[PDB]
C-alpha cells in the first residue's frame, strides 16, 4: 500500500493495514498542503488543522 508523495511525481509507502493516504494542511490553504503520506485513521480537523485521508492506493 503506497500513497501520493507531497510532490505530484512520486509517492510514499504505507505499512500493512494503512491504505488511507493522508494530506495535512491549514484550512486557509486548500490546494497547497504541506505534507501527504499514509494513515490508517485520519485525525480530527479543527479551526486551523485539516488532515485529508482516503482509503485507496495513492489517493492524497
UniProtKB/Swiss-Prot annotation:
<keyword id="KW-0204">Cytolysis</keyword>
<feature type="disulfide bond">
    <location>
        <begin position="3"/>
        <end position="21"/>
    </location>
</feature>
<feature type="disulfide bond">
    <location>
        <begin position="54"/>
        <end position="59"/>
    </location>
</feature>
<feature type="disulfide bond">
    <location>
        <begin position="42"/>
        <end position="53"/>
    </location>
</feature>
<keyword id="KW-0964">Secreted</keyword>
<dbReference type="GO" id="GO:0031640">
    <property type="term" value="P:killing of cells of another organism"/>
</dbReference>
<dbReference type="GO" id="GO:0005576">
    <property type="term" value="C:extracellular region"/>
</dbReference>
<keyword id="KW-1053">Target membrane</keyword>
<protein>
    <recommendedName>
        <fullName>Cytotoxin 3</fullName>
    </recommendedName>
</protein>
<comment type="function">
    <text>Basic protein that binds to cell membrane and depolarizes cardiomyocytes. This cytotoxin also possesses lytic activity on many other cells, including red blood cells. Interaction with sulfatides in the cell membrane induces pore formation and cell internalization. Cytotoxicity is due to pore formation, and to another mechanism independent of membrane-damaging activity. When internalized, it targets the mitochondrial membrane and induces mitochondrial swelling and fragmentation. It inhibits protein kinases C. It binds to the integrin alpha-V/beta-3 (ITGAV/ITGB3) with a moderate affinity.</text>
</comment>
<keyword id="KW-0800">Toxin</keyword>
<comment type="subunit">
    <text>Monomer in solution; Homodimer and oligomer in the presence of negatively charged lipids forming a pore with a size ranging between 20 and 30 Angstroms. Interacts with Kv channel-interacting protein 1 (KCNIP1) in a calcium-independent manner.</text>
</comment>
<keyword id="KW-0354">Hemolysis</keyword>
<keyword id="KW-0732">Signal</keyword>
<keyword id="KW-0123">Cardiotoxin</keyword>
<dbReference type="GO" id="GO:0090729">
    <property type="term" value="F:toxin activity"/>
</dbReference>
<comment type="similarity">
    <text>Belongs to the three-finger toxin family. Short-chain subfamily. Type IA cytotoxin sub-subfamily.</text>
</comment>
<dbReference type="GO" id="GO:0044218">
    <property type="term" value="C:other organism cell membrane"/>
</dbReference>
<feature type="disulfide bond">
    <location>
        <begin position="14"/>
        <end position="38"/>
    </location>
</feature>
<keyword id="KW-1052">Target cell membrane</keyword>
<keyword id="KW-0472">Membrane</keyword>
<dbReference type="GO" id="GO:0016020">
    <property type="term" value="C:membrane"/>
</dbReference>
<keyword id="KW-1015">Disulfide bond</keyword>
Amino acid at each position: 500500500l503506497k500513497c501520493n508523495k507531497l510532490v505530484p511525481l512520486f509517492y510514499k509507502t504505507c505499512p500493512a493495514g494503512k491504505n488511507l493516504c493522508y494530506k495535512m494542511f491549514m484550512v486557509a490553504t486548500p490546494k497547497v498542503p504541506v505534507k501527504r503520506g499514509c494513515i490508517d485513521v485520519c485525525p480530527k480537523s479543527s479551526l486551523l488543522v485539516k488532515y485529508v485521508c482516503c482509503n485507496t492506493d495513492r489517493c492524497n
